[PDB]
Design the sequence.
């Protein structure tokens, strides 16, 4: 939830998904044509395409900053993904703010 | 062809696929296949490089090159 | 994350510019000031008082109700957490990395 070995978990909060479009350099890893939060199996542009299973309703996406991992839709929850850095030093988790 | 999966026997059109696949000229199935014939030789799509290498560039049961 | 009845809410942002499209926190910041500030009361642009010896990447503190001492370079983040004075939420704004 904060660190898994050598991987830092970074929760970043945004007003909405459109505000991420201004966030360099990470915006180029999103696929903004897609609905529902995605994670990346590798480092390429538009690589965050894999549907996170049963996501929190305000989760916007997950970006692992290095290495590779299994790449499938509706198979891995956010908690499972925190175990799948596979060498990534940072796992960035993008959240939409909600007021309590 | 420009708009198609680059696997020799594959004709899947990628103009409607996710940009990641259209960028790298590979359909989803062949991106995950253990091997496909590409440019006349056995290759596997490297997860790390987003491109095919010949099989000896991969260690055992690996989807990225060493 | 709790001091009695006060919830302490840590929010981490991409950059200070990301806060400017955040209702309701944008109007309580004073973006003409540099260095993280806290508010002594509820009013537009009330986050003006300099937090003392602020940690790296702290962007500001907003208490969502009531009043407290209002002064520069006097209250650390740690002491501010005792200074809600009835505030139901203390928002602590951070810069990532
Ligand atoms: Zn194909
Ligand atoms: Zn490779």
Sequence:
């Amino acid at each position: 939830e904060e660190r898994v070995g050598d991987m830092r978990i970074v929760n970043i909060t945004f007003s909405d998904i459109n505000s991420i479009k201004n966030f360099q350099p990470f915006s180029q890893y999103f696929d903004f044509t897609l609905t529902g939060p995605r994670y990346n199996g590798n480092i390429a542009q538009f690589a965050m395409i894999w549907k996170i299973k049963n996501p929190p309703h305000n989760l916007l996406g997950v970006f692992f900053d290095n290495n590779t991992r299994d790449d499938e839709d509706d198979k891995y929850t956010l908690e499972e993904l925190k175990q799948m850095g596979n060498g990534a030093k940072n796992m960035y988790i993008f959240w939409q703010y909600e007021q309590k | 062809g420009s708009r198609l999966c680059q696997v020799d026997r594959c004709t899947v059109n990628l103009t409607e696929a996710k940009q990641y696949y259209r960028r790298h000229r590979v359909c989803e199935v062949h991106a995950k296949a253990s091997a496909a014939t590409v440019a006349g030789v056995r290759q596997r799509f490297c997860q790390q490089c987003s491109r095919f290498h010949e099989l000896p560039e991969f260690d055992e049961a690996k989807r990225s090159c060493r």
